[PDB]
């Protein structure tokens, strides 16, 4: 189907960037949209086939290239804060226009890379009171202190990703809602039976994948360089 | 111009979510509804071309070229339908509306509203407060305080028990912080 690289990217104002879009469906038509809170999808550029590209509603600041039928890269010439957004590549056979969308690229443009921070992650074990009232056991994962808002939180029980009994906040809280580059927090809950939580051989891990700086960004600060990394926390079941 | 009704719209589980969309250009040929889950990509769920009704599963799309609106009804709404729905119109170049968020709240069968305090599995010094098992009419208000954080409510589905529940989580740095303060 349609694939996009990277999923997330932070930039310093001025830096340039290339978002990749690929589609091995021999589709001839390809588009890039940006999506902004409260605006929906806005067309940036599009291409009817190889060698051909045309502008859309908001073409300014971006170039494209369609050399082949498979790829439609989008290039950001010079990052500005106003280009913080989620970009989606989309394709259709071309020649009844169902559009298929890539999974999207979320981009954050910041004044200074010193603003970048990885999350700290902790798992909070279930209340005994909950256990005795409800016979169910809720664990909470909290990811705190991170910037930009580029995380994916997952739960893993005995080594396998779980989706049932989970719910993660659909958006981060700003830790300083007034501050422009505020750091963020995100919580998730995983709820299992009391009996399952009570088995000491059962393992519960909250994984947060953070997208941050790469090997090649400068770092002089007192703290570890905030690179793309996985930060995780766990708990073992306990009869209690 | 593509204009959709303003959200988020709350819909009790089982009811009808009803979305609409006006387009300015009367010579538009093709009409679409996309579903977008939070953090995810738009997915085409309905195409409509001629005046009238079109059905697929629990979806009913309707086009009234006369009045220049398209609508989308989701029947017997389920919590898993919570999403943003976008209207797109063709002139096959697409113009997209700003989308309407729908929130389908669960019918909580046996509410048992309660606040519990949970401790860190590592340090044991740190905790969070969890408000859970309240009914979907229940209001969770923001903190009366910049050092106390309170999430929006979140719906979780334990398919292993056919059991859904609402929850919201709070926490703070200020010690002598009690769950007792947190939800008010």
Author numbering:
A (entry chain B): 3 to 63, 65 to 98, 102 to 103, 105 to 116, 116A, 117 to 246
B (entry chain A): 2 to 58, 61 to 93, 98, 102 to 194
What does the paper say about this structure?
Superposition of the free and the bound A6c134 TCR showed that, although the overall conformation of the TCR was virtually identical, the CDR loops underwent substantial movements. Although the apex of the CDR3 loops could not be accurately located, the portions of the CDR3α and CDR3β loops that were visible underwent large hinge movements of ∼5.9 and ∼4.6 Å, respectively. These changes were substantial compared to other structural studies in which the largest loop movement observed for a human MHCI restricted TCR was 5.6 Å. Interestingly, a nearly identical observation was made for A6wt TCR, for which the dynamics of the CDR3 loops were shown to have a large influence on the specificity and cross-reactivity of the TCR. This occurrence with A6c134 leads to the somewhat counterintuitive conclusion that substitution of the sequence AGGR with MSAQ in CDR3β does not greatly impact the overall dynamics of the loop, and leads us to suggest that the enhanced affinity of A6c134 was not attributable to “preorganization” of CDR3β, i.e., the MSAQ mutation did not alter the non-bound form of the A6c134 TCR to a conformation closer to that of the bound form. The CDR1 and CDR2 loops underwent a smaller rigid body shift and hinge movements of 2.5–4 Å.
Using this technique, we have generated several high affinity TCRs derived from the αβ TCR A6 (A6wt) that are specific for the HTLV-111–19 peptide, presented by HLA-A∗0201 (A2-Tax). In contrast, the engineered high affinity A6c134 TCR bound to A2-Tax with an affinity of 4 nM (nearly 1000 times greater than the A6wt TCR, or ΔΔG° = −3.96 kcal/mol) and an off-rate (t1/2) of 3900 s (>400 times longer than the A6wt TCR), as determined by surface plasmon resonance (SPR). In order to better understand the consequences of high affinity TCR interactions, and to provide further insight into: (1) how high affinity TCR binding is mediated and (2) what effects this binding is likely to have on TCR specificity, we solved the atomic structures of a high affinity TCR, A6c134, free, and in complex with A2-Tax.
